[PDB]
Amino acid sequence: SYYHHHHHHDYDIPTTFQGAMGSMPPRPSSGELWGIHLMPPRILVECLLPNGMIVTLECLREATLITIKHELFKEARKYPLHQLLQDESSYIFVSVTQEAEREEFFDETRRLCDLRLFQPFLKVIEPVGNREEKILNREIGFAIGMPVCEFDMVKDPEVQDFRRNILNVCKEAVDLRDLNSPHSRAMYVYPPNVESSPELPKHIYNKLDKGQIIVVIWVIVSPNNDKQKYTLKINHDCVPEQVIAEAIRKKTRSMLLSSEQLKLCVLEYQGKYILKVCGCDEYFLEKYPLSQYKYIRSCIMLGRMPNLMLMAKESLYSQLPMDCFTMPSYSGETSTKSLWVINSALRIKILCATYVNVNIRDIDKIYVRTGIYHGGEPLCDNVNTQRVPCSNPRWNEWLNYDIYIPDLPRAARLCLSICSVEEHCPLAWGNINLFDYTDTLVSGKMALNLWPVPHGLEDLLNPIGVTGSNPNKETPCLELEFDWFSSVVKFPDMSVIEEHANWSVSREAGFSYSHAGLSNRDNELRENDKEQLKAISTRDPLSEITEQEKDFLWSHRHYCVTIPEILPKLLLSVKWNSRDEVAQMYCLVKDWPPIKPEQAMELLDCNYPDPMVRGFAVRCLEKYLTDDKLSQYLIQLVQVLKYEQYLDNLLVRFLLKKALTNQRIGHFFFWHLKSEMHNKTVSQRFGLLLESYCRACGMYLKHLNRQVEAMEKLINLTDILKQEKKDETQKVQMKFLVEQMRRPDFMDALQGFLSPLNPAHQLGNLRLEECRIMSSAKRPLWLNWENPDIMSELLFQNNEIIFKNGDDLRQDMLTLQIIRIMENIWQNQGLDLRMLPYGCLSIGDCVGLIEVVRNSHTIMQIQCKGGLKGALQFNSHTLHQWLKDKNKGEIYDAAIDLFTRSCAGYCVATFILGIGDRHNSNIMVKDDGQLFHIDFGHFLDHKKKKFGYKRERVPFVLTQDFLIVISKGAQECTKTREFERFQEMCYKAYLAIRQHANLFINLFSMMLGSGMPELQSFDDIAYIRKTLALDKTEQEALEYFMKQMNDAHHGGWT
Amino acid sequence: LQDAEWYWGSREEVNEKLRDTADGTFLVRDTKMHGDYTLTLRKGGNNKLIKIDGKYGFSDPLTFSSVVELINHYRNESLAQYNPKLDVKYPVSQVVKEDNIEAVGKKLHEYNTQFQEKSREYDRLYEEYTRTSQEIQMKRTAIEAFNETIKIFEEQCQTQERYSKEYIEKFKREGNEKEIQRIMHNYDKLKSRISEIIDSRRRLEEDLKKQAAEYREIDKRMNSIKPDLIQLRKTRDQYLMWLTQKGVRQKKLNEWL
């Protein structure tokens, strides 16, 4: 009766899907031995001796190579040919690893489990390659997670040319380190963590009675144990040195000391000390307003009293070891024939695709689409005929592209794709750079392995996709042939392009009379024009320019130099297929006035592939981009590397140097690179760069290598929990977890190391009683550690962070970043909304770390805790009531201000970003009354890829619960001033982001590189236009925002 | 001029209607203090926007009295004689013909469930594809490793022959078979151990081809789901566009979808 008795014959439930127990997608990675995660606790290992004997020891999993060697030679005595062995000391272990390389085991402290051994056996040898020192490349390769030799046997010259030339940059940074050492060395390691502006916002300034803060300088005297407060009240804009003096003044005033006698005891003492933050390895190493250090400014905001420590410079320069940098082991055709000589069209011979997997039943016929590009295309897109369709497909056609060979621009790239047949549908794709890194036009035969079309791409050809062949062999391999001109054709010198450009201008100066299609060509320009230009300049990147506007721009390009910021628009108005034009543009960009980094960053996205342009863009960064702001946008700068044509480029040389100049950048630069290493689109590129970094980074490698080792332990641990210890009680799992963590290999590996989330924090001992597996199906780990600071107590005795194997953190990573940026925009522009962009860090393929925020609860917990016994309904007030229960007195009033100031900003970020729908289990409130969202899901409305269409959703819809709390408990809250003010925050917040919209477009545009399904192409990002309403006037935007806000709320909102 | 087939009268949803249409496909759009109308044309597969006292036009050759006047002229003809690099001229703008409105709306849910069921199958297989790409490559590296292991053992069964047959002929009578048995034993272990390892490597390679077989069958069926997913989605987009001509009903839609 229910189903019209219609039987579904195919359906079965004898296990029929991972919808049933629907969680934990990514796999796989075998761990401690081949084909098993965690090696047996007692295990048999074949020791291959130099006398050819296989003695098999039973070893414990956990045992050191010292212990194994020492037993092996006790037990080799019982086997024959003992007189043929040397004293054990003349030997080192070796075996084949899981990476598939015969690794010499030098560091004999390492344990059998920690070796990554593939088969459980050990060969004994006397140590070949007498530079024991140098074959701590294995350190580098451990950190990188692919062995350094793997490059050394790469054929490709570029790669080797990258490896050897990049050391230029590496040595230059190491020079800057040991320049005023040991101070500069500390300056590398412990850069001053500092806001960009010294200037204070007006809502901070008011927290300090005309710019004064009670600080607390601490000191130690004998033996260590006892410490002493010294509770200063110094100026906000006073520097560490002055703060160090006043502390020592008050330390050493005395009744046995005249003032004149004190002043002298100040001077001697003063500059023997520097300031630490109590509880973490941060320091105040340079002349910066105390307020400008991030720790101080947070202590102001949070209503806290900074606890700094006076630290002796020598007990500091004790803890910095030497950088010890070393140059590694690894240290055209008679003026060629200029591309402009070459007198022919472009033609490219397609040949045969070999490995094309298609149903001959389903698909009729298949062809190779082609085209030339620069981001957008310099000619009509062409294909080849539908020949030998499906069964063994072959076309030996010369395709003819209507562009003259000289009008190819430096950054030109062929983009092709095999397709199905209007049954039009791509099978594979691949793109090739038409020149190589040596400037040489591509000639003869090339063999290109192709990439599968990703999720979001319906389109036929995909030029934003990575340039070069797939490394994956068993895929469609479409080989092809380029035209040969009896000579290697090189791209023109700049000296030569400078001459053609100078000629092209002088030439235009005598073009005469009417030139209708004025289009691409007056010295004195009209005032209405000079206003239609700045009007263009202000427009965001995704407001696409017309042909009129382009031609209009291109003609007035020489005026466009007065308005530098136009450059992005200008450049997209050039006919890149007219070297006449392109050359002239190369002479503007030469001496174009440098621009702001937030604007110059656009110029490193996929829409600006020209090298000259990207140079200008790095030139901007080199000038304006501070180590602060670089660090802020480092994710977008690592991602934008993908869009570069060649390995070796100015942007890599920039970022690499910065990474080696400053270790806090270095840190994240390692991890973001390392994060992506599983992605074969960049494995090579990033590996090479990571080698360079690792080689030149100094002692930090050894710190990284422990962080890395800890992450691998946890990856394995969870991998096992997630398979075979699934379908098991928490009880049983948690037993297994704790059991494992107590083995000494885990104890070594998971204890004394730095937080990848923030290497300033140390991570000490595991308190395993506070370690546990959360309830989520992904089997995240809630891990807890002792803060081994001298002053643990003053900051936090326990550092706890969440490790989650199974979930792609980078969406979260970016939304949290974007939030952080909206906050800084808002706050630094004098208006206080308190977003808590908690720390998040993807360290691998759906593996990461999320910062714990102590004393915060999902609204659900609040309501479970506040729910009445007889299970009836949860009360809207309980939130309010649970909040009051914490905040009582003058406190209460201020906690509502917070809840209101946070809830407002989170409303506006959420709406604008369009993140996954908010609800009780993903919204959190802290004891002090701050609200903040977690688990963002898909950012730019990525469940609109099913239906969607002008949905402009409101994801944070403020139920009664929230409204009650905003309005201090009144009824009909929608009508109070409590609320009026709230709305006026929401409007003021919304416009601030709307005036910086350029940046947030560009940040999302820079992120197209990463293979996030939420960021497939520019129309994905276009959601942020509607939602900011950038096609409209601000007054309509305000009204649009209200409209949008009102309808979801059924509310007031005018 | 309101109807005008191609004439709709913002940037984003234009590009959605210009997504996956071939070389020459076009439509017209409407800040007004900027310009009035906007011919958005997709030449060669890229959005090419063209700006528009009575006479509508692109710049100076203004003698065309209407929006419809200017577009009929350039349906016949290319845009080269107006502006240099423009050598292209599809004014694109079934559904069982249904005037039902409601029963057209049920089909939208049905096609969307078909589509959303279809996207998951495509999504599933994309994970299978890449996991299989990984599992495969891990097998390949493992094979290099096995092969490498084997060398070290083959070298070890050789390594001993040099030293062991030096310690047979020197002496010989001393511990005659008391020595040379227990050197033969160790060696008879060593070669059968190789024997096992090789068989372990083979057995991976047979699994390699069965995995690489399945790997083809994923792509194979991905490429037969793909073309269906494009049409299934495109038919959904015309069913949804056909509705949103007559009754506005932007909000009613979301129950079906």
Ligand SMILES: Cc1c(N)cccc1N
């Ligand atoms: C530059 C560009 C082209 N040519 C096509 C579509 C989007 C964008 N942003």
